[PDB]
Design a protein around this ligand. Structure first.
Ligand SMILES: CCCCCCCCCCCCCCCC(=O)O
Ligand SMILES: CCCCCCCCCCCCCCCC(=O)O
Ligand SMILES: Nc1nc2[nH]cnc2c(=O)[nH]1
Ligand SMILES: Nc1nc2[nH]cnc2c(=O)[nH]1
Lengths: 238, 38, 261, 247, 238, 261, 247, 38
């Protein structure tokens, strides 16, 4: 018949291909389509949803509930010390690699866009305060004082009726994408929190409160290169 | 399309749709970015 | 493509984009254009590879078993499920309900434990309730209405397309419910998993020496619709017929809350 | 926009400090359409006898209480006419206005996660057996430890279904922050792979209430701070009349 | 010539495929088409035809004619006991797996639609009666009294000149299809028969009559997933 | 698609859809809309897979026999019939008359009981009355007007299409009649089965060692027209040239008429 | 619509309690068309000499009688001019109005299946031999047992052709329910794979009469209840004149 | 159609026809669902 020429790549099985294949069950009558609530068509729909961030994942608090809550107190000591501090890259950072942002990000090799950190204050209604949450791009060390941390993209968050604040990490990068894995060339900055003034509490209210942290993606967030997740780590037959 | 069956077809990878409004803000009363939440 | 970043300037007004309330069940829709001063940048970045069709649309291994030529170890049987292997399970246990039709690709590699002539394999699929063969000369193997693939070695792997063969409007990855109406019997998604057994054998009658073939089935979901997303699995996959687990740490630990590398 | 009222079938709900109601996945529940139905029998639609607020047993919230879960629709059996129409019918739908309410002073602190998880397929405490149906369904409590036996694995970090408990925010949920609101209302449309399903052998969703920030108060404040769940099905309809089932 | 690429699935033999193949006998003159009466174009044409149902298939009556006839008598004893009772699913039920409905249904894995049971009364012309034939969907036990059975979809059948009645089982299912094999998730209900009043017979007529049962599909009946039948069970060479 | 269910209400009238007479040879055309109250439901269910083309249109095994290389056991002969194997027989003995043209697919697997070079097979079909070979160097094998397929191993299975080669307007699965006009000789469908023998051999002249090949013929009917449906076979298939049977129970037994699981 | 009359070729049939006539597969018989014919010879069409009602020998229906079968056209040989045109011609068609009639009182009960099965290829009693032609063709009786020998396997559950006897309802058939009707009329068009066929060596259909509900009556009622078969070919035509065959 | 012969063609699975009236109600006198049978 028509003369054909077999090129390289014939009779192979590439797993990520787009070919038509003969149906095993011809003229099959599928079940009629029904409207189920909550259809997800893109995984960046479910990476842009908030998720509580285990910031206090110190040794002995991870397999508990105390990993999520950030201890914030009222006192005279250690008000020139950070409240927390962690890497901003949501893939390898030991704080936000497990969030919904970090779970959907570890199936990918490259990522772009702005992430935002939402801080819910879980104190009493009478306890008021102000906090400085700052982001500093890489190139220098971690900010060790509040003076060095207020030079980065920060926010002074007054705690009142609203009781929640969003720090949008503004995607200051050299390149268009960053590696999800940890490499020096594309490493995100640092997210530190500081006491702007203090937490002030009335005589009868509990003096030890805690901030609850969130993290999600913005509308310009995208992931770029599919890979397998390292978390599952199957040992053998189930 | 070289086959009659619809399951015997290429994957429709080209289409890109999304509705993140049903997950990020599923609230009844509309919440404006500008206004306070409550 | 993704949304561009609009230029903003210094602002001093009674509007507060940063101030939110998480307790409203509401994720704030703010951008970096609301918190700080930004320049106008045109984002040509697309979300084309994060879609469900591109994410799930890769062929993952779902079944490996051996069957020998020259008893019941002469052929293989799978009783189809996604739960055999952990990596595709975690992608499918990420959505509660999902509707897709899959094509399966077999990778059949015979290995000698005297010369094999040539090996031809039969992959017979019985839908649920059909006659099961108990022997290689079963009589079941003749496939009057069972779908079946005959494959001789040295060729392209056998790829065939499968429709959406579920009774319900979608496959259910999770079934928080019982098998019997008295809340008794089998618990979980096992009750819903009614897809027939898969039978693989050598159509070669015998061999002068012991030849052991192994099959590798690769499902690739296509035409995928997924509903009700749920968080990815944290703890490992002890069983296949139930979501049972040993409790594990939520995240890797640090030494202090301030401690950072 | 903090005060709100919900009136269903002769039972109204008043709240004055609350977030706005959260509609699960942006779909308000409704009756089953003629094109998406499967049973050619006239369904029973008792809109005022069943679609009304039912108040479950309240639970005490303590400084070390891990959490609770209910399993619906089943938890609403033998409660009013909504439970009687379960025993006589084979199929059922609803839309479950869930109103979880927990009040405190301005000198109490704490933060609950009121999350509705469709198909919260639990996990057994011992990984090689199966647990009875009385384990799943006085709501069952989580534990801040690891239990062993013929029980559901009710640790809190793995919320019973074996995920990160901070990642339960993907589901329709609210927070009860005691400084902001004292109630959380979630509306859940009928979410299932099937148009109608039996209400006894199948648990469409579970209601998990998990204190991320624990309850704390000094001496003199009221120690007994109860959490009350007020669930009201909506657009409930039934199909398949038969003799009453003994369960 | 034209460059081609061999995809997976080449050089295989899928039994249920739709390909063109070279004719072994080219330019063959087939026998002219003739009109034979009774052309069947669909197997649901011949599953919608009635067929007598062996309801009385007790041990010792199956290899006989007494399997088809249902004993209905006139007496004072056992009028609060069912006349018959069996599973409604026509695939695995030991009563109607062999009917024409069940023979064409066992080539398939899924089935949908309403089945209807027709009851022919084979008594004398002077003997009259009334019967309650009921269908109860699953979820509860089998109805043990006529009080529990008249809560399901029933019919009170007066026996007179017409002498035949149709109980249409109305397809009350959760899903769009049911499994032909027996599984708990999709199991059909129960079909029980009861004495509404009694069979009343004149002095000279025979007092022991019997009802003859039928079963067929409705117009909305369909089968969905082809499989092999388990009945044939070939042992070896013929 | 199948018929929708129309909505009905409570009825009290002199019309009686449930009341029938089976003795009229008539199957009642009633729906659940006539007996009980129904809602309007739109049935998108189709009867596309219950048609005769989809039911019969799957390749079923019809013939297996061995033939050895390096006498009369050197080649195979089949004298074509559907009745060799039970599963496709029960589908074809379901219609009295049926008119179809079939393509046949061979699965030829050589097995060693010293190295086979390569095996090439010949499947020669002689129409009825043609010369039959009695040896492999028969002289009959040259196919001047007999159709024949040459196939070397390691390739795709040999598929060729066959027309409707019957003398009559349809194939007859059953022939309640005799061979001779005096009502004598062969009884049954054997008289009508005049389709030629099928001869399979190795075109390899010899082999250094004993190689036994087996062939598997798979008929798949297409362009199918079937007339006069008849009930499916109950009792098994003792013979090939006659519908002879041992009497069997019509259905599986119960313990009582009320007894149910 | 219970009274009916059939008049064919000087022979009429009167019935007053009957179901309506059943036309086999919805086709009424007719002469062979010019486009579907195969023999270029002028066919013999004796419409009134052969196409008329022929009454076979009646059979006694008892309490334990299993059933009967006739094999047509052959059963109609040496009966009138329809059998004479068989012996002189090689080909033949017909359309066989079959009128089975069995009357009783209102104090008798029972139910017959009058079914016409095309190509009822019978089965031999011993599975490894072949039986003579006198076994197939006083109609042969079924047996409520298992016979052995050089005979047709005339068990009733397997109706001779090896199927379920309740599944003979797929064929054109009626029922004689003694409370409703006392006759059953079936019209059978020419059903064969060939336009004309020989009437001796080939049995186009067999008439099976099988009592599903057996005959029952108390003392005093008439014990002799006979079943009479009245078969009338229709549109019969013949081709291929030759010397008479001796059979 | 890559071959001239009609038997050397794809199976016409697509067409769906049916006439169940020649099996379920082959009676001469029409029988209405509403009316009594006799
Ligand atoms: C040789 C023929 C092969 C035919 C194989 C048929 C495969 C059945 C379909 C796969 C089942 C998919 C189940 C997914 C359920 C889930 O997502 O939890
Ligand atoms: C190498 C050439 C091969 C040609 C093979 C020709 C096959 C003849 C056609 C098959 C016969 C089908 C008979 C069916 C009769 C029935 O349905 O009972
Ligand atoms: N009352 C009310 N009815 C609806 N119908 C559809 N959406 C809505 C809603 O949001 N509120
Ligand atoms: N008398 C009569 N002639 C026909 N010609 C075609 N159909 C019929 C029929 O039903 N009755």
């Amino acid at each position: 018949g028509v003369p054909v020429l077999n090129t390289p790549g014939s009779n192979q099985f590439l797993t990520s291909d787009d070919y038509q294949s003969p149906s095993a069950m011809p003229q099959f009558d599928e079940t009629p389509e029904m409207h189920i609530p909550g259809e997800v068509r893109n995984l960046m729909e479910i990476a842009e949803v908030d998720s509580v961030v285990p910031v206090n994942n110190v040794t002995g608090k991870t397999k508990s509930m105390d990993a999520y809550q950030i201890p914030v107190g009222t006192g005279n000591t250690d008000k020139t010390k950070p409240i927390f501090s962690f890497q901003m890259d949501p893939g390898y950072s030991s704080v936000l690699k497990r969030t919904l942002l970090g779970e959907m990000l570890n199936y990918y090799a490259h990522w772009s866009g702005s992430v935002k950190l939402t801080f819910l204050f879980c104190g009493s209604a009478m306890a008021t305060g102000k906090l400085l949450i700052s982001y500093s791009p890489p190139g220098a060390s971690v900010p060790t004082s509040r003076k060095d941390a207020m030079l980065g993209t920060h926010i002074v968050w007054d705690i009142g009726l609203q009781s929640s604040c969003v720090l949008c990490v503004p995607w200051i990068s050299q390149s268009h994408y960053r590696m999800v894995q940890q490499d020096p060339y594309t490493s995100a900055g640092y997210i530190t929190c500081w006491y702007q003034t203090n937490i002030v509490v009335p005589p009868g209210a509990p003096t030890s409160c805690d901030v609850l942290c969130f993290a999600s993606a913005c509308n310009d967030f995208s992931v770029r290169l599919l890979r397998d997740t390292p978390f599952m780590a199957q040992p053998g037959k189930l | 399309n070289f086959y009659k069956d619809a399951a015997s077809s290429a994957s429709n990878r080209q289409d890109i749709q999304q509705d993140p409004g049903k997950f990020t803000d599923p609230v009844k009363d509309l919440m404006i970015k500008t206004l306070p939440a409550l | 493509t993704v949304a561009n970043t609009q230029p903003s300037g210094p602002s001093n007004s009674t509007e507060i984009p940063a101030l939110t309330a998480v307790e409203t069940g509401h994720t704030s829709q703010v951008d970096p254009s609301d918190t700080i001063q930004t320049r106008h940048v045109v984002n040509f970045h697309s979300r084309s590879e994060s879609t469900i069709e591109n994410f799930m649309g890769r062929a993952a291994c779902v079944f490996m078993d051996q069957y020998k030529i020259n008893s019941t170890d002469r052929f293989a049987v799978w009783t189809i499920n996604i739960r055999e292997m952990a990596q595709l399970r975690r992608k499918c246990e990420m959505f509660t309900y999902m509707r897709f039709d899959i094509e399966m690709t077999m990778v059949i590699t015979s290995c000698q434990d005297q010369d094999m002539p040539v090996l031809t394999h039969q992959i017979m699929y019985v839908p649920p309730g059909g006659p099961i063969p108990a022997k290689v000369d079963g009589y079941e193997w003749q496939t009057s209405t069972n779908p079946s693939v005959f494959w001789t070695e040295g060729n392209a792997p056998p790829r065939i397309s499968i429709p959406f063969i579920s009774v319900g409007n979608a496959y259910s990855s999770f079934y928080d419910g019982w098998s019997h109406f008295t809340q008794d019997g089998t618990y979980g998604y096992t009750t819903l998993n009614a897809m027939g057994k898969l039978y693989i054998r050598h159509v070669n009658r015998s061999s002068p020496h012991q030849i052991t073939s192994t099959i590798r089935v690769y499902f690739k979901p296509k035409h995928i619709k997924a509903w009700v997303p749920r968080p990815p699995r944290l703890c490992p996959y002890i069983n296949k017929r139930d979501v049972n687990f040993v409790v594990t740490e939520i995240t890797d630990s640090r030494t202090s809350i301030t401690d950072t590398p | 926009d903090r005060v709100r009222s919900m009136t269903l079938g002769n039972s109204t709900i008043t709240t004055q400090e609350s977030a706005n109601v959260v509609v699960g996945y942006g779909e308000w529940p409704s009756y089953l359409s003629d094109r998406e139905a499967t049973a050619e029998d006239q369904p029973t639609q008792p809109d005022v006898a069943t679609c009304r607020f039912y108040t479950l047993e309240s639970v005490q919230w303590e400084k070390t209480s891990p959490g609770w879960w209910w399993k619906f629709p089943e938890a609403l059996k033998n409660m009013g006419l909504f439970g009687q129409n379960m025993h006589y019918h084979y199929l059922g739908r609803a839309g479950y206005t869930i109103h979880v309410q927990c009040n405190a002073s301005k000198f109490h602190q704490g933060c609950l996660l009121v999350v509705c998880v469709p198909e919260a397929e639990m996990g057994c405490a011992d990984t090689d057996t199966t647990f009875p149906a009385t384990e799943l369904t006085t709501p069952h409590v989580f534990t801040s430890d690891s239990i062993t036996g013929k029980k559901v694995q009710a640790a809190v970090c793995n919320a019973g279904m074996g995920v990160g408990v901070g990642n339960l925010t993907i589901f329709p949920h609210q927070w009860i922050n005691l400084r902001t609101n004292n109630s959380a209302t979630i509306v859940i449309p009928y979410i299932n792979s099937v148009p109608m399903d039996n209400m006894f052998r199948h648990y469409n969703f579970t209601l998990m209430i998990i204190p991320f920030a624990p309850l704390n108060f000094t001496d003199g404040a009221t120690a007994y701070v109860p959490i009350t769940v007020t669930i009201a099905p909506m657009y409930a309809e039934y199909n398949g009349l038969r003799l009453a089932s003994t369960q």
